[model samples]
Target chain A: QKESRACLERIQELEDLLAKEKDNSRRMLTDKEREMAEIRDQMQQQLNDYEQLLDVKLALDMEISAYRKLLEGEE
Target chain B: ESRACLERIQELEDLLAKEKDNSRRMLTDKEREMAEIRDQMQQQLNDYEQLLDVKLALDMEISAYRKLLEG
Candidate 1:
């Protein structure tokens, strides 16, 4: 759904930003940034899964509940 | 209703397994790419270091040669 710039450009930007950090700070920043990016990517993926599951759950719940109500009305 | 719940869970389990496999493969690729980037930067840094070392050695050698000639 989202299309942006080239992968190489993004990688270059990350490298440039990383290189600008002083040697003493560079490792920590790179670690943190990489971790955050990975976590966000995973969360987004799981959120998509949750959305699908919730939709199915809602539909099934409604159908069953309506069926039960109909049976009770007949009795 | 119970059967529906069981079927739903089974579907979710299958979906989760597939997603897990995909995530594993994706993360592996990402890690490989990260390693490649790190290696590229390290190689560049090493090349620059070597150039600087060679330049310094050459400068010293040239200075020594000039001194020997003058003497």
Candidate 2:
């Protein structure tokens, strides 16, 4: 029984160390995730700008088509 | 139960050894990987900024066309 008690104590010690190291790995992963999120934020802004540019392009093309028709009618 | 406890002790020892190896390497190995990623971001972000410049020019041209159509 005494031997069992001593072994239990040793197991407790190793478990503490194991848990500590696991936490360190998790913290590093969080840092990695934070960086990834930053990159994604920048990418989303770029996509927004692209959508706005496309809208403006559509409007410009529509205006040109209207002018060409007006000129034809005048002829 | 004593036998199981002893076996658990051995398992913990092996697991603890691996964890310590990671902990020791954390500074040089893990952080070195992180820095490489940061370096990649430096160039990657610069490329994005340049692309924004082209987009900005397109935006300005589109505004000008709208003004012309209005007048």
Q: List, in order, the clash count of every candidate structure.
A: 0, 0
The estimated TM-scores of all candidates read 0.44, 0.50
> Residue B29 lDDT in model 1?
66
Q: Model 1: how far is A71 from its true place, Å?
A: 99
- Candidate 2, residues B18-69, lDDT tens digits: the string is 8877766765675676677666666666665666676567567666666766
RMSD of each: 40.3, 6.4
Best by DockQ: 2
Q: Report the C-alpha lDDT of model 2 over A10-38, residue by residue, as the tens digit.
A: 88998998998889877876786687678
TM-score of every candidate's chain A: 0.59, 0.64
Colliding residue pairs in candidate 1: none
For model 2 the interface RMSD, in Å, equals 6.1
Model 1 chain A poorest 10 in a row by lDDT: A17-26
Off by over 4 Å in 2: A3-13, A70-75, B1-6, B17-71
lDDT of 2 at A72: 52
In terms of TM-score, which candidate is strongest?
A: 2
Clashing pairs in 2: none
